[PDB]
Design a protein around this ligand. Sequence first.
Ligand SMILES: C[C@@H](O)[C@H](N)C(=O)NS(=O)(=O)OC[C@H]1O[C@@H](n2cnc3c(N)ncnc32)[C@H](O)[C@@H]1O
Ligand SMILES: C[C@@H](O)[C@H](N)C(=O)NS(=O)(=O)OC[C@H]1O[C@@H](n2cnc3c(N)ncnc32)[C@H](O)[C@@H]1O
Ligand SMILES: [Zn+2]
Ligand SMILES: [Zn+2]
Lengths: 401, 401
Amino acid sequence: RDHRKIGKQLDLYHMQEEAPGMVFWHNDGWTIFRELEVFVRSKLKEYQYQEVKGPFMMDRVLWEKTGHWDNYKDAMFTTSSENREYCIKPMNCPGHVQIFNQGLKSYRDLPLRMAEFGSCHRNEPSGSLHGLMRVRGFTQDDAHIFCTEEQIRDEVNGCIRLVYDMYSTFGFEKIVVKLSTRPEKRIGSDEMWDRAEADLAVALEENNIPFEYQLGEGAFYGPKIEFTLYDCLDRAWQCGTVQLDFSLPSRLSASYVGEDNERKVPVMIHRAILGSMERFIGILTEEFAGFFPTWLAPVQVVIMNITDSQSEYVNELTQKLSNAGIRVKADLRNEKIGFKIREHTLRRVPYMLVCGDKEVESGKVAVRTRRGKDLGSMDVNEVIEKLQQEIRSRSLKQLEE
Amino acid sequence: RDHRKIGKQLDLYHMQEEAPGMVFWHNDGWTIFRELEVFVRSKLKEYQYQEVKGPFMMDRVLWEKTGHWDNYKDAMFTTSSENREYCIKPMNCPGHVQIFNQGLKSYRDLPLRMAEFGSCHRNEPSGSLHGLMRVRGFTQDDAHIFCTEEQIRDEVNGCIRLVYDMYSTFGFEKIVVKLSTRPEKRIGSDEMWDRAEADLAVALEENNIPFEYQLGEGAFYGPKIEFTLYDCLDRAWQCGTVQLDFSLPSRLSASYVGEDNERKVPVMIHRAILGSMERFIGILTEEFAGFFPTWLAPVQVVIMNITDSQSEYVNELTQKLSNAGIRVKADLRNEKIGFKIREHTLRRVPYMLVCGDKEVESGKVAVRTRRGKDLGSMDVNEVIEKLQQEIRSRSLKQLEE
RNA sequence: GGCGUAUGUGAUCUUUCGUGUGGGUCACCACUGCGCC
RNA sequence: GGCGUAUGUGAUCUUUCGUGUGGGUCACCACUGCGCC
Ligand SMILES: C[C@@H](O)[C@H](N)C(=O)NS(=O)(=O)OC[C@H]1O[C@@H](n2cnc3c(N)ncnc32)[C@H](O)[C@@H]1O
Ligand SMILES: C[C@@H](O)[C@H](N)C(=O)NS(=O)(=O)OC[C@H]1O[C@@H](n2cnc3c(N)ncnc32)[C@H](O)[C@@H]1O
Ligand SMILES: [Zn+2]
Ligand SMILES: [Zn+2]
């Protein structure tokens, strides 16, 4: 179904009018959000990315330089103190550059992979807003790569590979590529865009990724490979993206030293795998439709007693499981077990554990997937070791399926 | 020494003028920042707190209601779209209340512990700024507790206890308490503040915490227990804090159902243990003075070869250790081992591993604390198991000290 | 936007009941769905 | 704010050297410290 509903459904979040296009991440939604971060971190570790964090706003003067002010100022939010006037960051590109500029960087510091779960803000037109897909305030999972241009290849490829290798974890079928070309208001010489565009295209076809030119689209600062995923109504949504920047690195004057002990402006690659935390979450919801894989489930397990007897043996287990590091909860409520199983199933809990008198003098637990498949009572540790296995591997399929 | 120095020193971060009072968290500082979160999360799990996340800004109209607009508007930042005009959040109190208002809450939903690593912004006077201690843009580790007033006690105590039990991890000696009373521009009836103040005080003395009234201080919305830690120049700095709110919950009209099936406005307790991520970090730096405990160390280990030979056996180990989940790095650079040991020691790496020909045909590693104590070569797994031990327990003392 | 409902939400009496909501009373519309203006 | 330096940063030749910086050349002031205006 529609994420917006499943969201209200599973208490993943909510939104209010006094905060248009601003998400009020509820506890459970958060968990998903958060759990995604840990995932990203994980994938990035291999490729050795640096995780930074930039200012929530900088001086308007800065953006004037980058170009944002002259071709984006309409989507930019702004405040100011007695001091100057600042823009709330739309992207984290400028920021990263600043951090890059501290000190003298040699070619040997390249390629420089700097990532950040950067919180952005954009004055998206009232009309264009939509659930977690198109919001005024989101969180990119981007990074920017500083590198020589011989590095551009391997560098871009690594990105691509990362997008697929990562999306694959969610088992996405529809992944269509687009290659947006020099937009109306760009900032580099055609000569630059020529190379930039070529480079990207070459990359695609060099990995045999089929695509179409998004002609007239793309960063005001460079060509842009777009990875689009689709939703409930098979509507296209841009999620991942790899952009080749030739201006900015110079505009904010960054540079490194070659062996020729010479000043060289680095090349800068923009890129976000999931794209935007809220948007990508929206898609996951859309896909699985409330059936987030065990690892990504707000609540992973539910242990319930049949009568007010085994209620202690339930607290017992919910405990052992909580230490096991499993998002578990106990439904000891005074209700018919049938009810419990109901509520939680439309709640989507990957696993439900029934504890009746029978199981108490067994140390066993009546296991049952949300899908309904009664997995039959089984050893405690057993369920744990197995759940952990399923979570640890962020596997999509549950036990016995 | 002064954090501001140690910071520039260990590349923990930097600041620029176009972004006054806004931190540019560099990779290694971030690590510390981040590692603190994981710590907070941890301590909060026990007490079962919900981790949400609110809007980076809401409608001015909202704050007019809470009171912020009429007695804080000066420290508040503001932007706006065609739509309305918003204030950048100073606190996350309002937000949390919004999230609390979704649905009908019964008394049984209480006490409601809602936490968030809420990113705040305040127009602190140019003059009052100072390193990480007093910034325009920081990250509170607060939460807000919704509860009946019989719960106020146990609730506040739980906070107190949390502050100590947590601070104790860092071995803080100077922890002085203050109890700020109804400020100039408050928002509740004296009658309310009377109770509010009393309550807090009772709490303190009930736990035998010595203190002094900060008369005239305290939230425009309630009394305020202050936990002050001291820095390099033994200057007082407010870190932890527990505030008893009696207005806001009603101002934003929140309520729960008693058994009397009746509408009751909840009592709300504000509270931040570390206080502010940046500030507390500042203090840690000041204290340890660049000697962050193993668990908190931007880099925990460094493995270096003596000659270009054992260089592979180094990549070897740095690997095994990286999988061990230890922030480790290899200094294979073409330099005298003595140099390496130097640089990294003033860099503060908790541990340095020398790998010479001798150790290559031993599988052993020449271990040596940053303090200098040569721990003598020892088994690899051995060092690992031991380091993990030290990290897992966030112990302050290193191996053999 | 307003009003009213309920297989909605909450309180509550009864029920103690083995796997998609047991029975009743009261409250409210904040969530969900349905009506009316 | 500007200028100049180096036990500062970078490049580089030499050095391969066992635990707080080996020797030289060049570059620059972005980091750190020191000077001058
Ligand atoms: C990739 C970054 O380094 C680059 N600076 C950048 O900002 N790229 S972007 O502007 O093309 O956006 C990256 C991704 O953010 C997400 N995103 C962009 N705008 C929004 C929005 N309004 N709401 C939600 N997600 C968004 C999309 O997944 C998009 O692919
Ligand atoms: C505790 C919260 O629920 C409450 N809303 C609140 O805002 N408390 S506060 O305003 O007293 O600040 C809490 C803590 O934030 C930190 N803090 C406040 N202002 C700043 C600042 N300008 N820079 C750095 N840290 C700050 C301090 O550690 C302070 O104790
Ligand atoms: Zn970018
Ligand atoms: Zn608060």
